[model samples]
Target: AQVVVSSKIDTEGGVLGNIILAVLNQNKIETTDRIQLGATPVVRKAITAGEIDIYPEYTGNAAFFFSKADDPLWKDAAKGYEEAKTLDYDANKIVWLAPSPANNTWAIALRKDVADKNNLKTLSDFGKYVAGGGTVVLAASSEFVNSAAALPAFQTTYGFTMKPDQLITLSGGDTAATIAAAANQTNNANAAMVYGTDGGIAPSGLVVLEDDKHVQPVYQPAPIIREEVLKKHPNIEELLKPVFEKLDLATLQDLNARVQVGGEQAKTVAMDFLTKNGFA
Candidate 1:
């Protein structure tokens, strides 16, 4: 029997999928690779239909998968993971392994210098800074600027606002561009739209503001497998647990950077990480 591993169509997905494939192979498991299969819906459909035996999924996405995106429990990392595990197992007979200690969700990051100068460590600080008339020009994609669940949610939850002049709208949604704009001070932008685990944040000299109010969903990645697959290869759970546990925000950022920013292959990056951590 072989386990078919797959992922979504993105740099992070490629990196993660490669890790899963490599790890299972290292452990002598028969496997098939379907990395970067498609977008979320496509990958999700494949998993539910049993076309793919395993893939990495975010706990926060469970809310959307279950039509409970409005639930506040998703804002809490532990609760969200637990709920996702419960729901997927009970409803779809899918098993959720241990999740990474990272949140790959929508976030706002400020230039490190600016953040340090103002002692801004969290969204609350950013809100206070904005309200106090601090200069803050943010570079973001139109979607982030316009989405009610994105910046608007942050603004409303933090009690701060970004005026027209304080924004630089980018055509692309990639955080790499936004991080660069802020890093280079393009149009005097001192802040950028970012995901919590973007590879470029630290390299671009930015700091992600904490979402203290839990305004956004927590997106911790975990390997989800079909129940029958797990039953046959029960050791898969223990094998992946420590691997995911080691993938904290900074570690993921660095690994992702090697692929997305440095132009390295995802398979190479995954193996390098696993080898260095003694998992390979």
Candidate 2:
């Protein structure tokens, strides 16, 4: 009855994976931790291939998982979850548990002073500022830079292009480095690619520019498991549902900050969260 729990190699992944691991352990569910496994592709492949039994996933990512990125249903929260649940189960016999209410979507955030001086409150303002010769050095992962559903969508929707020299592409798809670059002003970086619910945003003195046009799809986090494992341990669903249901955007941001800002370990923060919330 040991479930192999894993997560992507990122701040949120660490936090979410630890929470899942803690909850399962508290319930006396046998498990093995393989947290911080890799980027999205590596972790996704691992789960699909049965190398891992469960991991956190984003609902909107299902569109990419099924090559239905053009569909509009992914933009809606309930519909996105339902679609993901349906598609993954039918294709790979996976089960999507209840998801958090947080919308951790891709976003661009500006260092406080840079955004204040430029009056950049929205993507529209950012585009105008960039076009009018405002200086901005954005640090981001290569995936964000190359993915059409990410930076390209922002560029197309807002009509702005960050020149090659204006960008610093990171090797991994984690916001921690990108956020740190902006926070420390590394290489004179004044902006970063971040998720909507990232805790580091406020702590790093960065302000997320409004995506007024809503370019990204809903990205609520959920624990997805192999269907065979769920059938073997049916209580897994009941045990995790309440904990995830309480993770709203603000709650997730606070928990993430405890790790990224307070310098606490993800496992510690996760356990504290579960204990305080009476879930442990």
Candidate 3:
């Protein structure tokens, strides 16, 4: 049998993919596994072309990928997952398994010291800071900065602006790098753009600004499988349920920290988590 694991090379996807592989191996689901790694578009294309059988994907990513529209609102986690499921069922004939409780949404992160001193713990507070002419340095990928669902949406919903020079765009890299830049006060960036599951956030003394304006969608991560392949392996859901359900944001962050900060190999970290969690 052949099982294909598709994911982006980023920390979140890579770590999650490793967990899935470890779980499957532990279940004695004997198969030759293939990993197809690429950007969002490339990975989606592989899925459509049947080059990959299953992969971990986010609800918001599914919405953007298949529907070509931003999530209408930042509804509760259930609503967003349901919406993504509906769209995927109709468009791609894909099956989305139970989503992890982790909501990997976008948000701005400021240095903890700055936030504490200024009493800025949420987007509303950041908006006030920006409106009061306080400058902020931000680091984000070009795509995220330009996408309507990302920085632009945050700006529109919160009505905050920074000078051109204050916005520091980093080449698409690991969140660790971004957090490091912000912590070290490099790149003239006082704040770093990051997802909630970034392991380095808390340890690096970075605080995620709350999206009081509800600017970002609930990005719950789940496994997306091709319908035909799932039918062939009807027990796939049973195999995946325990693994995915147990994965919360804290669990993911710890796993990521092992690989990104602790210098463990991604596969090794994944196997360790699976074995420790009794999935292996």
Candidate 4:
């Protein structure tokens, strides 16, 4: 029986993690247990220590953690996945499975009304607006503010900066709240730092600003397994390939909405997806 130790259980990542586990269970691949480790660092350490067998990992996150470098390129998601895979294989003897197409990359989102009124469709256009002294407020996590893969990089690339008061830093809550605030005009926050796959962004009337400059890295999610485990269970690759290929951004967001907004149990939602997709 393989044990899975995941980071946090409430995130979109966690939701997908449980979904994979459920599919495996339906196939009679007995799993030992599920454990919720606290953070990415802790989960990575646990995997290294053999505290667990496998878990889901984001490509950009794996690269940043294992290689201690920024993602080499942004032109292709495959390039980013391969780079992260090489680092993990060389350093830790871990095997990364096929990655899902869902890109959890950083994105800038604005209220749809604001975008429509100003004819803003892309990050480049937003930069033009900012340069013309259009005051825009941005909400993001404190970590996002400091990371190289964050707003500072975006500002440097675009040659613009919001005022200190205009940059509102939230804790690591769902990007939904920030998007909601911006969409509803509840706070003075006119824009938000969002992930590409956030479920509420489109429905809440938040328009994702296109990254014409491609400043963010590809953050496709993949299953990371200990090499020894894969050697023992070689069939797991075939088991996961179809699952990975089929899980796109829309699928991920819909799954997240079911759990986060619809109050459905994670296991139930996982089962439903599997059955509907003919994977059960």
| Candidate lDDT (C-alpha), each | 0.93, 0.91, 0.78, 0.77
C-alpha lDDT (0 to 100) for residue 209 of candidate 4: 83
Highest TM-score: give the candidate number: 1
**Candidates 1 and 3 compared by lDDT, better number:** 1
RMSD of candidate 1 to true structure, Å? 1.6
Candidate 4 lDDT score at position 225: 87
Regions of model 4 farther than 4 Å from truth? 3-7, 70-76, 113-121, 128-137, 140-149, 159-177, 187-190, 199-203
Model 3 clash number = 0
**Candidate 2: deviation at residue 2, Å?**
1.1
Task: List runs of model 1 lying over 4 Å from the truth.
Answer: none
* Predicted structure with the largest lDDT when compared to the true one: 1
For each candidate, how many residue pairs have backbone atoms clashing (under 3 Å)?
0, 0, 0, 0
> What does candidate 1's lDDT look like per residue over 1-280, in tens digits?
8899999998889999999999999999999999999999999999999999999999999999999988999999999999999999999999999999889999999998989999999999999999899999999999999989999999998988999999999888988889999999999999999998898886788888889889999999999999999999999999999999999987898888898789999999999999999997
Q: Tens digits of per-residue lDDT for model 3 on 1-280? A: 6777767768777888877777666766555455538778888888889888787888877657755454464345777788778888788898989999887877789998789889998898898888788868887777777877678877877787666787777778466667878888886778987888887876677888877756777788898888987887778788888888888866887887777778888889888887787876
Instruction: Please report, as a residue range, the 10-residue window in candidate 4 with the lowest summed lDDT.
Output: 1-10
Q: Residue 240 in candidate 3 has what lDDT?
A: 85
